[PDB]
Design a protein around this ligand. Sequence first.
Ligand SMILES: C[S@@+](CC[C@H](N)C(=O)[O-])C[C@H]1O[C@@H](n2cnc3c(N)ncnc32)[C@H](O)[C@@H]1O
Ligand SMILES: C[S@@+](CC[C@H](N)C(=O)[O-])C[C@H]1O[C@@H](n2cnc3c(N)ncnc32)[C@H](O)[C@@H]1O
Ligand SMILES: C[S@@+](CC[C@H](N)C(=O)[O-])C[C@H]1O[C@@H](n2cnc3c(N)ncnc32)[C@H](O)[C@@H]1O
Ligand SMILES: [Zn+2]
Ligand SMILES: [Zn+2]
Ligand SMILES: [Zn+2]
Lengths: 432, 432, 432
Amino acid sequence: PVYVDIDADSAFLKALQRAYPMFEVEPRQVTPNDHANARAFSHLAIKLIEQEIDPDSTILDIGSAPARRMMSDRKYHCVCPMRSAEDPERLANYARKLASAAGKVLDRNISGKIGDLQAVMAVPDTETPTFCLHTDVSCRQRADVAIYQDVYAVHAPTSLYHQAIKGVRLAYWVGFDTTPFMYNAMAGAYPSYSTNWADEQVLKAKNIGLCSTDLTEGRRGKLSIMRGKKLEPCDRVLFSVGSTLYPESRKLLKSWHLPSVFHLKGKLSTCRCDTVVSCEGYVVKRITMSPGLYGKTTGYAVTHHADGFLMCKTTDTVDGERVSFSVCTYVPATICDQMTGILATEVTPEDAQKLLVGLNQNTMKNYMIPVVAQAFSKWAKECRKDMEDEKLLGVRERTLTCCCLWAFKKQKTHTVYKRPDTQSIQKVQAEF
Amino acid sequence: PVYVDIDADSAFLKALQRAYPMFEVEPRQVTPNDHANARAFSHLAIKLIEQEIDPDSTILDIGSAPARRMMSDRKYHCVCPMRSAEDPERLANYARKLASAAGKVLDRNISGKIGDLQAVMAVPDTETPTFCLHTDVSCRQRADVAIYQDVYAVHAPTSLYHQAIKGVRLAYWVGFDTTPFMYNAMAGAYPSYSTNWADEQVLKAKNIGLCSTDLTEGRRGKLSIMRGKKLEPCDRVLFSVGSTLYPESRKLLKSWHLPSVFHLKGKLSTCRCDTVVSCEGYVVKRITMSPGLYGKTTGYAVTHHADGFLMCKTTDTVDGERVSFSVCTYVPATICDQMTGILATEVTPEDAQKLLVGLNQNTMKNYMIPVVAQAFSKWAKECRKDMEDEKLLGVRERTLTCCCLWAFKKQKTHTVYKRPDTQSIQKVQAEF
Amino acid sequence: PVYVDIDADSAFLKALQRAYPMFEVEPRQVTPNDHANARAFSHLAIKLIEQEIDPDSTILDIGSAPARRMMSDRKYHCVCPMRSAEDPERLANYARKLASAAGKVLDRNISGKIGDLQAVMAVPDTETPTFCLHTDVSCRQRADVAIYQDVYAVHAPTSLYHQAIKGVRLAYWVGFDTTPFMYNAMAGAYPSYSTNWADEQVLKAKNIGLCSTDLTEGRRGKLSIMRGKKLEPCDRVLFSVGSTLYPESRKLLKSWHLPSVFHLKGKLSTCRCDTVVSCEGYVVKRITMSPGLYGKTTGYAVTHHADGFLMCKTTDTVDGERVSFSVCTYVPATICDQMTGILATEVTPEDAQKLLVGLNQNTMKNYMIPVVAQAFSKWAKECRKDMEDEKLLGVRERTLTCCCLWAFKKQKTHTVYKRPDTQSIQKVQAEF
Ligand SMILES: C[S@@+](CC[C@H](N)C(=O)[O-])C[C@H]1O[C@@H](n2cnc3c(N)ncnc32)[C@H](O)[C@@H]1O
Ligand SMILES: C[S@@+](CC[C@H](N)C(=O)[O-])C[C@H]1O[C@@H](n2cnc3c(N)ncnc32)[C@H](O)[C@@H]1O
Ligand SMILES: C[S@@+](CC[C@H](N)C(=O)[O-])C[C@H]1O[C@@H](n2cnc3c(N)ncnc32)[C@H](O)[C@@H]1O
Ligand SMILES: [Zn+2]
Ligand SMILES: [Zn+2]
Ligand SMILES: [Zn+2]
């Protein structure tokens, strides 16, 4: 009987129950959290991890908040490298809770957790069995299972290797789906979790999920020192999960988009990465490690789309300058199935938006209805073009460019639309 | 009373109950598996195999996961050649299970399986009665029945001969239907199992089940070193069963499309291959083995279509380059029977898609709906052409090409549509 | 109380009950057999044969599987020539079953059947009372009744004479209706049994029951060594009953289309052939023997059509080459009676197909609806021409071709449509 701090009549509830069929999910709202869905998913993911693994095993959780691991009889190595700015306050709250139940609870090893804390504030390199202050690439504990809950700011292969050489055979990564970042989107949204994200180059946009601009009359533009001439995604992006900000990096996010099979080649030598939980943009990936190189890797990563996924071209204004960039999002499967019949023809963005609103009135958040409509209007258009320019079966028409090279014409692809029950396949680096 | 890890209200349930009338299939969902239908079908296939064969017989299963064979009183030779990269993790889980029930269960010969495991990790050539680490062409155990559960990456005649010389009289192959690869399709889908497969040449496509492309403006194409000038399916294909990747080969897949009667001719010398279970793209084939050469072989293989099967030409964009290739899929029999009345005429693909959507709103997955529409729109067109160009009865009009040869005009065949209650007959190699 | 391994709600059930009024047919599905109707008909045919004949008589069954004849107190001479490739496997299964009830059942003479088996695998010419390994024209057993269940690959007069000189007075042939093959059809279908059959020259066709072709762009045809110039049925045909292949010969199949009265003239010298069971393409014919020559023969064979029978010209593509050939099938009597009103006029194949589908939506299989429509569209057309070109009563207009010969004009006959309650009369050879 798992309890979730969400509304008793929230639409996400059902989806959550579909994501965790082995648990009886019951709502109990005690906080008007702006991102309660994320916390509920994280709670059920942790409960699933505890259920699925060995009860007698030390559990190290990378970059974790020690306050959340309370009331858990399982041994936890709450790794707190003290790197981020939020960590001192998390430790303060954890110490407050640890000092508030000295003679209240005894089965949760709190009596030894007090000693562990007193030890770690004596010598900075104090590797207590249950708590330490080091990064994941420097901790010396030798446990069996690793946990990365909402940990995106770290290189996945390096950390996985560092725990693999540390005896960790199982790793769990609970976090946002990394498929949008393998598509190189300038901005995107997880509407089911009230989450938005955007590259720093479009944080001053107008009509995206995470942006803020100013009223202007259409004056002369900035005498920019840099010409620009190109708007391409940069490494630094901003995540707004409710009203909370996280600065993330595209390289580190893509590092966690591990293929199904990959190799770890360092001092010690195959590994697997499978998506065991996937709900409306939040995923739980079960990585498992095994010493010795066995088999061979294709370097291919697969994402299965229960709901529709879109990455489309859209025109906005950044600081008042009209530009076009890519925006990604998720659309519920019911909406995608109801849109199949209409999308057989060329539909204008306005009619598509009106039909989408009619199907909504809310299954999907209205704030991203327009762009999706445009996406569909592009998709149904492009497919129609593929109807008109029917090529011969198995013939490529390439022109010899007066040299030893061959060139072809690339069509206009404005929308990438992964329908429900489809899969995105992306070539990724293996054999780290 | 067989229990299936599927939803309690899933549409596939009924089809599953229609595939195993001997059993009482009851749903019990404990995992949100992206490919639960595949595992349910495999489970019932194993149960059917166990019911239909001799209880007193050592049962060797080729390339099997030893964890699934637990709680089975029948003797199992779990052959684990340690070739793929997922196998060490399977052995780790199997050893965990074998060490977690030492004093718990005693009727499953686990006490002896522990000794077998400790034997196999002592000498690499330890052929224990219940476990060994060798390929199917090198193991020396002499049992009576062979099982190939989801084993596609092996040569069927070679493995069948190697087990026939080992005394194996019965072989079972549970896996995806191999008819699409005898048709040489570039890509295909088993929608009832959320499965999408594609040739490596078209993994960067736009609107197929297994693909992922990027947004482009229509720039100059790649200055390719190879001219191309032909798009034909290659040996390497990728399977996505839910969110799991499998690199398969066309030759080994076609090797398992055995004819009804074929001969094994080596050191020792008829064989039969029949499809005993067939459900919406997943088949269980019962190969029966017999020493000596008896009768004669036609070299013909037969596939019966309970549901409609389609392999049609479709135009997509691979890496932004517009090409045309073949895509195959299955369509429910109810849909095919409802489409029969209108397909007497020429119907545009848009009208076909709208009629398909009206008949769907879901019997079939919507992401396959458009292309099937195209297929039907092509098929109904081509049939109409055969109506217009009525030839004479038993006359072939071939022109003498000013030589001792004869030539004829080939018509445009863009769609192969095997309706329900039809059969595909393909000439394959016999007498290996 | 006969039990049939068919669905409890199958539409064939009623027809089966109409074909065996003396039995109580009850469904009991224990296998998802692709050709369960054929096996149910064979079971009831065998049981009807057993009921209708002398309980105290040795019953030799030609080319039979010995596993089927189990649980039958009647003495059986299961003749197994070992000619086909399926015989080692059926005998292996039979030995398994005989060895699995050595202390279970004792009223089925199994204790003596074990001795008979041990005898036949000692000397190859061991003619045991109940089992032997010889062809029907070499076995020396002298019994009273012969049974040919699904035995098409043998010459009817030769085998019938060979068992007539062996004292067999009664013979039963349970198999497929041979009327389509006396009409010399290139392809055909028994839809009620999911059965198709095609000549080897049209196995690469496009839109028939048993065919499989490939997508082509309409390129240059094969530089054939043979000119062709004629497409006529050949001796070798392929039968697909569900998903099982049988290579049959037209000569041996037509051999069993025996007339009502025929003579056997050899060393010993009338015989009768009557169709005692007929159901939707499956026939049980009762042949009765009498020594000596009595009466005289007309050489005429009669087939009574309870349901409509069609053989019509249709245009398809064999290996992409557009040709026209004959296709035969059966149509339910209700459909034919509903077809009578509108066939008084000329009806386009499209309208005929639409009205046929309206009458169907399934009484008849949809996959053969179009061609039948074409057939009807031709038939109602040709009849109309006979109405327009009204000749005189008893006058034959024939031109003297400047010689002692006379010639007439032959009309275009594209469809033969034997309506229900009609008979096909064919002149066949007698006095073998
Ligand atoms: C989201 S915050 C902590 C919340 C945590 N994900 C949870 O749900 O319990 C991410 C944390 O990762 C830690 N971190 C930063 N860099 C790290 C690294 N290189 N290795 C391990 N942890 C790190 C930071 O201290 C930061 O507090
Ligand atoms: C799908 S995985 C195992 C799962 C298995 N099909 C099951 O359901 O239990 C296929 C396995 O076949 C094994 N294999 C690969 N090549 C083989 C070969 N040549 N002979 C026998 N097994 C092989 C690999 O070790 C791989 O783990
Ligand atoms: C349809 S299969 C047997 C199944 C059998 N009719 C039944 O329903 O039980 C055809 C069989 O005819 C047998 N056969 C082939 N040639 C024969 C011959 N010349 N005389 C008698 N039987 C023959 C073969 O052994 C083969 O098994
Ligand atoms: Zn530590
Ligand atoms: Zn072995
Ligand atoms: Zn005999």
